[PDB]
Write a protein that binds this ligand. Structure first.
Ligand SMILES: *[C@@H]1O[C@H](CO)[C@@H](O[C@@H]2O[C@H](CO)[C@@H](O[C@@H]3O[C@H](CO)[C@@H](O)[C@H](O)[C@@H]3O)[C@H](O)[C@H]2NC(C)=O)[C@H](O)[C@H]1NC(C)=O
Ligand SMILES: [Zn+2]
Length: 281
């Protein structure tokens, strides 16, 4: 059992919110965490007609942040078994989408939208990959086990696409060492699974799908979605920097040509809404 602590798992970020009270989820500040709570709450309220069940199902989704799990059985290594029978859908819920069944309903966490990412700064804009030391926060030491990390394909759109096996690429597969936590770790466990993964860079928000799979007959696996984005450096690209190899003039602090219409002036914004008139109905 456990969850991704660095970058933080989507469901772990939600479980740090005040979801216990008020019971309708209005104490949850993050709009996507609040929508995930309210999705399961409204789903269960509409099927059973019981508010107590709606509250319990929605709370369970965030209380079980360390149990986003699925049982694969002895053939946990069989890719088609995982993709078609164990976690065929609702990947960020580890396939759990039924409140009265084992693992409940965590499908609110799998909805699309403006999930808040961990923003990773780039050291250099030509970096193809960023070696990032991932931290998995185990609430129990389960060995033998291994970790797989997937990343969404380059054109994945977090606002509208579901994370599915068809839009995920495997970037890491290894046994990871159980190590001491580094300073300022948000993991509440005493030891952690820390591992250096080369994360492919993206210009838009991506999702890492981390799978912690036990190698045993029961085959319990833990699956978490991790929202990430990349902060590019501003200015000209390093390869386009021509340096000079060889009267007193100064620029002022005056707002040059203030009042003249142009880019980012109110005229430009008003013009844009007229240019987008065919986009409104
Ligand atoms: C990540 O790496 C692990 C470790 O190499 C991969 O697990 C291994 O996967 C292979 C192929 O699915 C398994 O082989 C199969 O074993 C069964 C039983 O012995 C045999 O009947 C098959 O013919 C085949 O040889 C292998 O057992 C398994 N290893 C362990 C320790 O579980 C895993 O597939 C990799 N993940 C991805 C996404 O590729
Ligand atoms: Zn466990």
């Amino acid at each position: 059992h456990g969850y991704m602590s660095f970058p933080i798992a989507r469901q772990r970020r939600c479980s740090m919110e005040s979801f216990w009270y008020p019971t309708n989820g209005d104490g949850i500040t993050d709009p996507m965490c609040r929508a995930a709570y309210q999705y399961v709450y409204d789903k269960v309220l509409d099927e059973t007609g019981s508010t107590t069940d709606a509250i319990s199902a929605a709370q369970y989704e965030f209380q079980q942040d360390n149990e986003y799990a699925a049982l694969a059985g002895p053939d946990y290594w069989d890719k088609c078994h995982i993709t078609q029978q164990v976690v065929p859908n609702y990947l960020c819920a580890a396939g759990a989408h039924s409140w009265s069944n084992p693992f409940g309903d965590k499908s609110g966490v799998d909805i699309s939208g403006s999930w808040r990412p961990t923003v990773i700064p780039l050291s250099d804009n030509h970096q193809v990959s960023v070696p990032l030391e991932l931290e998995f926060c185990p609430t129990a030491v389960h060995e033998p086990s291994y970790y797989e990390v997937y990343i969404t394909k380059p054109s994945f759109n977090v606002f509208i696409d579901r994370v599915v096996w068809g839009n995920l690429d495997l970037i890491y597969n290894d046994t990871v060492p159980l190590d001491p936590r580094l300073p300022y770790s948000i993991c509440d466990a005493d030891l952690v699974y820390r591992f250096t993964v080369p994360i492919p860079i993206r210009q838009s928000q991506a999702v890492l799908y981390v799978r912690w799979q036990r190698l045993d007959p029961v085959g319990e696996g833990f699956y978490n979605c991790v929202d990430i984005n990349f902060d590019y450096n501003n200015g000209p690209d390093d390869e386009d920097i021509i340096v000079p190899d060889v009267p007193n003039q100064c620029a002022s602090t005056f707002n040059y040509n203030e009042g003249v219409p142009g880019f980012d002036t109110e005229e430009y914004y008003k013009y844009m809404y007229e240019s987008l008139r065919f986009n409104r109905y």
